[PDB]
Design a protein around this ligand. Structure first.
Ligand code: HEM
Ligand code: HEM
Ligand SMILES: *[C@@H]1O[C@H](CO)[C@@H](O[C@@H]2O[C@H](CO)[C@@H](O[C@@H]3O[C@H](CO)[C@@H](O)[C@H](O)[C@@H]3O)[C@H](O)[C@H]2NC(C)=O)[C@H](O)[C@H]1NC(C)=O
Ligand SMILES: *[C@@H]1O[C@H](CO)[C@@H](O[C@@H]2O[C@H](CO)[C@@H](O[C@@H]3O[C@H](CO)[C@@H](O)[C@H](O)[C@@H]3O)[C@H](O)[C@H]2NC(C)=O)[C@H](O)[C@H]1NC(C)=O
Ligand SMILES: CC[C@@H](CO)NC(=O)Cc1c(C)n(C(=O)c2ccc(Cl)cc2)c2ccc(OC)cc12
Ligand SMILES: CC[C@@H](CO)NC(=O)Cc1c(C)n(C(=O)c2ccc(Cl)cc2)c2ccc(OC)cc12
Ligand SMILES: *[C@@H]1O[C@H](CO)[C@@H](O[C@@H]2O[C@H](CO)[C@@H](O)[C@H](O)[C@H]2NC(C)=O)[C@H](O)[C@H]1NC(C)=O
Ligand SMILES: *[C@@H]1O[C@H](CO)[C@@H](O[C@@H]2O[C@H](CO)[C@@H](O)[C@H](O)[C@H]2NC(C)=O)[C@H](O)[C@H]1NC(C)=O
Ligand SMILES: *[C@@H]1O[C@H](CO)[C@@H](O[C@@H]2O[C@H](CO)[C@@H](O)[C@H](O)[C@H]2NC(C)=O)[C@H](O)[C@H]1NC(C)=O
Ligand SMILES: *[C@@H]1O[C@H](CO)[C@@H](O[C@@H]2O[C@H](CO)[C@@H](O)[C@H](O)[C@H]2NC(C)=O)[C@H](O)[C@H]1NC(C)=O
Ligand SMILES: CCCCCCCCO[C@@H]1O[C@H](CO)[C@@H](O)[C@H](O)[C@H]1O
Ligand SMILES: CCCCCCCCO[C@@H]1O[C@H](CO)[C@@H](O)[C@H](O)[C@H]1O
Ligand SMILES: CCCCCCCCO[C@@H]1O[C@H](CO)[C@@H](O)[C@H](O)[C@H]1O
Ligand SMILES: CCCCCCCCO[C@@H]1O[C@H](CO)[C@@H](O)[C@H](O)[C@H]1O
Lengths: 553, 553
């Protein structure tokens, strides 16, 4: 017969389990629901559900009435909510992890083979009628067409919140620590073990590689001097696998710890920023700690930057993204009261949802100059010709695409979005609406309801046949935005839990790690605590330019 | 000058940090103490310390007055204490981990390179005057002599608590999951990634190896039929690295997942027991779940046995070891209230303290027959000639050495204890008395106080010069026992936290994992919950013999 699990009968996180020839059962353990499918609510659950406001409403409360928020921020309520935000959001993510591409059930292998992404919902069983469960047509909308029609940039739609390329690239740099999908093993698998903010894009994803980059004196990273300015070394001084155009592969060529940053100037830019940071830090340690070995100076500088990364990410990055009036606060001691696992494992759906290409503009403006994609991609010289100050200034001033809402990827990078849909189909990712459910939301009942506009709605409806069969990635980028947001409801609510668990699940946030000692004393500790995009830039430059995650005025 | 940290100035878990040319500072963050060395107690700490009874006293309460305990066990207090036991004990161990052989300071590498054991206290800095801090002679007592004199069995001292070889071997089997010290990388390093009860001694420490053992039908492990009895397959049917005497390396040769079990008959015995278990379980799954793949049947059987292992370990193993009247209880839901990290990382000191060779007897009695060490070690045929029932019966009936108290390793295996002291010295393990401190105890002020007997006391005293300089491993095995115990104060108090954190830090204990679903439903779940040494034996045999962790009457 039909695999019963193809109907996704078990609700509210209950686990579908096949029995006998053709039966199923749900595991409602700890779901707050009981009954055949986990839909009869417990005493308290039912109180919560009635008294739960909508994601939209909360969003509104947070984006409105600064008078109340200026007061809140000023008091401890800032910490009370920050804690709330941290615990309720985190909690929706399995820790320790659950599944992967091979196992649609907890297993020792899935727990211990750190080479996999995890997954939050299982796969569509291989044996289902329609390719995504029980509804839709047999064939699914042709990837290519789907993007052409709904994701291809018509005219440039700027992000309504003032988000800049200075942000965009940081977004890319940063994420590419833990998105390193494997060429050799294939989709579902990751080179970026560590699965978090390990800075394995500065330090390399392996010790052999990291060892090529280390200067081994005073625990510094290797570098080179071009125009009296510090930059990463060449592969001539640091042999190590870097994907680059063969052509000028010695000098001009650079090595960084993420084998892909050689490509776009904005990547190498941040790589330069952080390297200058690493060494600047060491300088301040060796000051304090003459007796310290090179190894210690290295490992400790690392920890500083890891901490520094997470502060900026939370208090600058996510602050800007969210457009909140609640002033976000990075402070691990907030979670010492709570029950939190200090471990992280990158999920595939996360991989899928962080494909923020729409941010990317039509061209790249550097003061008077205006560079084509053709001119910008692979530009081996652009970083060193312009100088970090002038490039930071540049990106800080140029806008970026409203991520969600649709029709907003520039045609150059459109094929990436196509491949994402292609692998989505390879990974057997469940229907969008099923993910809506798992992240607490109500599933959509129409395409018109998904994106509040008839044209795309009816056209999608015709293509997919059914809203339930609407795929995950399309779902995310086509959904209507809240008023004046970078993206819509489903992006926030599925994005948050992954992001926060990534950030706070880091061991350095742990009670065990989060001490002055661990960052070599107060100067270390306060470097983390007083971290700032503007500091990470200007402390490492001769000049201090415009540096921000939003365009001026 | 002298590295200030060689005095171990920072108390109560405060972290010594070198500053400038010759200064130090303590990191008393969250120690419950403040002041220069972390010795000025906080308001509550001071209340706890006054109101803390001695380890000895508690031990007495637990081993005495069954009338009170028969009542306690019968009520919920059994769970209240079991929880207490679990939380207070666990807590003394860093999670996430701290150091390793390379780093005497938290680092990303030490956090993420799972190839190391961790360590609870740092090393003796390389630059200290005496080889163990500031006291003792320059040279340390000659390993060989130290064992000859104090650890070599005179006459056999049986364990006063009735502990048998049936226990002894389980102890060895079990532990050798997570003690797999690496030949190639050297001391400080481990083949046994997983760092816990992963059953990587049944399933192998790698997927390539595990794949050689799997039958790949109905998710069973490969096997062979000798005398109508099931046993592990030969290397002819399962090629895979097994350390064995070259000689009869085809048939007669066996493969198991731990490359060392080929040696002693009691190891292969348990290997046989668990393999029979694995397949017996699969049989019961395939019954329920016809549609299930081979992969699922395999991963799930695993989880059952992992759970089954931990129940028996806690409720039978540690029960017997402890001689408690409080009836220990394996129940993960006990910790869902608490703040617990569901991760484990095997420490070196743990490695060091679990060298329970003294358990091993003078010879091996199998009913009428009496086998020399010469006859027992490497006996390729002994398992299959005798039959598991008759061998279980045998070990269940023969005693075992009082582990602590001294002078109790049989001369055959004495060199192991020598090597342990040798690597202790390689790993730069801190003084015994420093470990006493870190595990809450008061340091010893005399050798006479360590083992309450003048002869060994004054002789040690002369050899080591100072109690502070007394090494870790000697300390553990020479210390006086509580009345009628298998070992003394320091073994329990340093052993417990590691053991419980190993057991309960397992992901399957997690809220996220601990569901009927995860073990494929109620039959799975109850297999874990109703687990028993006696079941693990008799359900897999034609006959049911004497099977117990203690000798009869
Ligand atoms: C001009 C700038 C950019 C270019 C040229 C670009 C291009 C690409 C390419 C070629 C791929 C790989 C396609 C594949 O493997 O199928 C990719 C994937 C990806 N992109 Fe972009 N992208 C840009 C900006 C961004 C931004 C702003 C983000 C948002 C943080 C981002 C995040 C990602 C991620 C996370 C992946 C998948 C990585 C993995 O699975 O390992 N990229 N992009
Ligand atoms: C006749 C039985 C036994 C023999 C012949 C034996 C012998 C040995 C040998 C040869 C070593 C390795 C020496 C070295 O690498 O320096 C060793 C280490 C060890 N033994 Fe025993 N032993 C026996 C029983 C036990 C028992 C009852 C236990 C207690 C659980 C035990 C636990 C260990 C452990 C945990 C190690 C270190 C493993 C590692 O670092 O990987 N053994 N023993
Ligand atoms: C966990 O850490 C250990 C030890 O740090 C890593 O193993 C070791 O890796 C290094 C570099 O890969 C090897 O060092 C040697 O140094 C010279 C310096 O020029 C190098 O050129 C030589 O080729 C040589 O390999 C070392 O041999 C190797 N072995 C050990 C145990 O020291 C291990 O790779 C780490 N584990 C993981 C998975 O990262
Ligand atoms: C994590 O899991 C992956 C996938 O299970 C492991 O990689 C894969 O390992 C297997 C066995 O080592 C390879 O399978 C192939 O199967 C045939 C069957 O006879 C075997 O004889 C061939 O030699 C062949 O290798 C497979 O190639 C390999 N690659 C992948 C990604 O599938 C990986 O080893 C695991 N990671 C760790 C560290 O355990
Ligand atoms: C909808 C458009 C605007 C609102 O005007 N942006 C957001 O809501 C972005 C956002 C918030 C608020 N996240 C938090 O849940 C969050 C924000 C701040 C703190 Cl402190 C904690 C969580 C995210 C977590 C992850 C994420 O990427 C995947 C985006 C977000
Ligand atoms: C001193 C001799 C007798 C007492 O007569 N044995 C013990 O005390 C052994 C013992 C107890 C009690 N452990 C618990 O702390 C323990 C026991 C039971 C539960 Cl449920 C939890 C912890 C150990 C944890 C680990 C361990 O090996 C390293 C031994 C032990
Ligand atoms: C739980 O869900 C299952 C499957 O989704 C339900 O079975 C369906 O019953 C509904 C209404 O009673 C019908 O629409 C279908 O005929 C059934 N579908 C399938 C696939 O079997 C089941 O009724 C639910 N459990 C209960 C008892 O409410
Ligand atoms: C990559 O960028 C570099 C430097 O940014 C380009 O060289 C400059 O281009 C501008 C206008 O495009 C001109 O003024 C000059 O030809 C160059 N700079 C000056 C003032 O000398 C280069 O052409 C680009 N290469 C690629 C890959 O397109
Ligand atoms: C903390 O410990 C250090 C070092 O162990 C103390 O320094 C010692 O002071 C004691 C008594 O005052 C003397 O025995 C030694 O002369 C000192 N030893 C060393 C190695 O310096 C220090 O006094 C303690 N901190 C305080 C202020 O109580
Ligand atoms: C290993 O053990 C086997 C079987 O347990 C030994 O063979 C038996 O030894 C007993 C007495 O030692 C004798 O009755 C026989 O010689 C054997 N069994 C019978 C009844 O046939 C064997 O000698 C041992 N080998 C080693 C490694 O010493
Ligand atoms: O008021 C709020 O206003 C929001 C923005 O208009 C809506 O999306 C919410 O549903 C509503 O509750
Ligand atoms: O904020 C709240 O946080 C929760 C945790 O993500 C969500 O489930 C709710 O929908 C959201 O409104
Ligand atoms: O009574 C207890 O008796 C024990 C055993 O005699 C002692 O070790 C304890 O110190 C004591 O408090
Ligand atoms: O039991 C108690 O458990 C605590 C945790 O191990 C110890 O510190 C105490 O000394 C012990 O008596």
């Amino acid at each position: 017969p039909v695999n019963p699990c193809c109907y996704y009968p078990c609700q509210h996180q209950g686990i579908c389990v096949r029995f006998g020839l053709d039966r199923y059962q749900c595991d409602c353990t700890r779901t707050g629901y009981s009954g055949p499918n986990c839909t009869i609510p417990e005493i308290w659950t039912w109180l919560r559900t009635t008294l739960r406001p909508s994601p939209s409403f909360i969003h509104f409360l947070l984006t409105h009435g600064r008078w109340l928020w200026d007061f809140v921020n000023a008091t401890f309520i800032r910490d009370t909510l920050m804690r709330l935000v941290l615990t309720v959001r985190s909690n929706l993510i399995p820790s320790p992890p659950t599944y992967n591409i091979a196992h649609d059930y907890i297993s020792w292998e899935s727990f211990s083979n750190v080479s996999y992404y995890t997954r939050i919902l299982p796969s569509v069983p291989r044996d289902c009628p329609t390719p995504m469960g029980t509804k839709g047509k047999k064939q699914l909308p042709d990837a290519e067409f789907l993007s052409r029609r709904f994701l291809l940039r018509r005219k440039f739609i700027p992000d309504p919140q003032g988000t800049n390329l200075m942000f965009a690239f940081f977004a890319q740099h940063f994420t590419h620590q833990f998105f390193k999908t494997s060429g050799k093993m294939g989709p579902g698998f990751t080179k970026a073990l560590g699965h978090g903010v390990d800075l394995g894009h500065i330090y390399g994803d392996n010790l052999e590689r990291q060892y090529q980059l280390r200067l081994f004196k005073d625990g510094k990273l290797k570098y080179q001097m071009l125009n009296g300015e510090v930059y990463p070394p060449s592969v001539e001084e640091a042999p190590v696998l870097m994907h680059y155009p063969r052509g000028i592969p010695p000098q001009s060529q650079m090595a960084v710890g993420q084998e892909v940053f050689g490509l776009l100037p904005g990547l190498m830019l941040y790589a330069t920023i952080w390297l200058r940071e690493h060494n600047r830090v060491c300088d301040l340690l060796k000051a304090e700690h003459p007796t310290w070995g090179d190894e210690q100076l290295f490992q400790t500088a690392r920890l500083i930057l890891i901490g520094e990364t997470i502060k900026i990410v939370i208090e600058e990055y996510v602050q800007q993204l969210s457009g909140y009036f609640l002033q976000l606060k990075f402070d691990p001691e907030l979670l010492f009261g709570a029950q939190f696992q200090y471990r992280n494992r990158i999920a595939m759906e996360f991989n899928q949802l962080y494909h923020w290409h729409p941010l990317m503009p039509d061209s790249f403006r550097v003061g008077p100059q205006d560079y084509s994609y053709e001119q910008f991609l692979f530009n081996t010289s652009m970083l060193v010709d312009y100088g970090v100050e002038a490039l930071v200034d540049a990106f800080s001033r140029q806008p970026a695409g409203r991520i969600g809402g649709g029709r907003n990827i520039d045609h150059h990078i459109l094929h990436v979005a196509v491949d994402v849909i292609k692998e989505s189909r390879v990974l057997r990712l469940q229907p969008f609406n099923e993910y809506r459910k798992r992240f607490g939301m109500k599933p959509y009942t129409s395409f018109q309801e998904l994106t509040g506009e008839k044209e795309m709605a009816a056209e999608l409806e015709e293509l997919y046949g059914d809203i339930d069969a609407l795929e995950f990635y399309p779902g995310l980028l086509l959904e209507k935005c809240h008023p004046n947001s970078i993206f819509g409801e489903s992006m926030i609510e599925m994005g948050a839990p992954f992001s926060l668990k990534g950030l706070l699940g880091n061991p350095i946030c742990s009670p065990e790690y989060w001490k002055a000692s661990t960052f070599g004393g107060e100067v270390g500790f306060n470097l983390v605590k007083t971290a700032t995009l503007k500091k990470l830039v200007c402390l490492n430059t001769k000049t201090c330019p415009y540096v921000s995650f939003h365009v001026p005025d």
